[PDB]
Ligand SMILES: O=C([C@H]1CN(S(=O)(=O)c2ccc3cc(Cl)ccc3c2)CC(=O)N1CC1CCN(c2ccncc2)CC1)N1CCOCC1
């Protein structure tokens with residue numbers, strides 16, 4: 001728990017479940033296997049600068 | 052945008068520009084998906100017939116990567132009124148899909164709670180557009196960006212000649228000559244988080260441009276999320 005600590009160590013959306021954190025991503029991303037990082041699914045995921 | 056830096060290649064890929072028949076950029080927008088643009092309701096009054104343009108960074112030199120889109124359906128918020136400027140939000144359904152390429156990509160829609168808790172509690176946000184670079188100058192020819200600090204909600208009201216409603220929020224500077232300006236309305240206000248950008252506000256209004264003691268007033272995007280989703284399903 002404690003999405004307040006460092007955003008629960010998530011890449012994006014952090015939620016709490018009375019005792020633990022539950023990370024989730026924006027549309028176009030899929031939650032990584034560590035249940036924390038977010039991974040794109042297309043070459044143009046929302047919010048990324050096309051540098 | 053008064054002051055601030057220029058949007059360099061690929062930096063502001065979600066910027067959208069509404070153009071009148073004279074192909075004049077009169078307002079901004081934020082790309083939400085291949086089909087939707089987010090803008091301000093009052094922007095649908097500054098023109099008659101208009102189209103949304105993306106992939107543009109210099110309104111006078113065919114960069115090749117630009118693209119024009121027609122509007123199939125414009126979703127204005129009923130509750131919007133010009134006497135209060137409340138509910139300054141509208142969604143645009145594009146006739147044809149926006150193909151994402153360099154300089155053309157969507158900004159993420161955050162979740163209400165996480166956003167209010169993490170995105171807006173951040174130190175700053177970014178606003179951008181082709182608007183005027185001064186209060187009396189002319190419409191910028193290059194797309195610009197500007198890091199604008201989040202402004203305490205109290206000061207915001209204390210400095211505002213008008214009622215800052217629940218659906219608005221201040222961002223910018225008190226004395227520093229930097230702020231959005233005419234033509235930047237409807238444009239995007241995004242917050243950066245771990246190198247991923249999220250829409251957080253729509254360029255709405257202000258009293259003049261970059262005036263001392265006055266702040267930029269943005270539409271609180273987090274306060275219309277569910278509304279924005281209802282519009283994506285067209286409604
Ligand atoms: O003069 C105006 C308007 C906008 N402009 S503006 O330069 O372009 C302008 C527009 C949008 C902005 C958005 C941000 Cl974030 C920051 C600065 C901005 C400046 C300034 C102004 O004082 N005003 C006057 C005011 C008229 C009434 N207002 C309210 C607000 C709350 N409740 C009731 C009324 C706000 C602006 N015009 C004439 C030209 O065409 C556009 C409209």
Ligand SMILES: [Ca+2]
Pocket residue numbers: 107108109110111112113114117
């Ligand atoms: Ca161009």
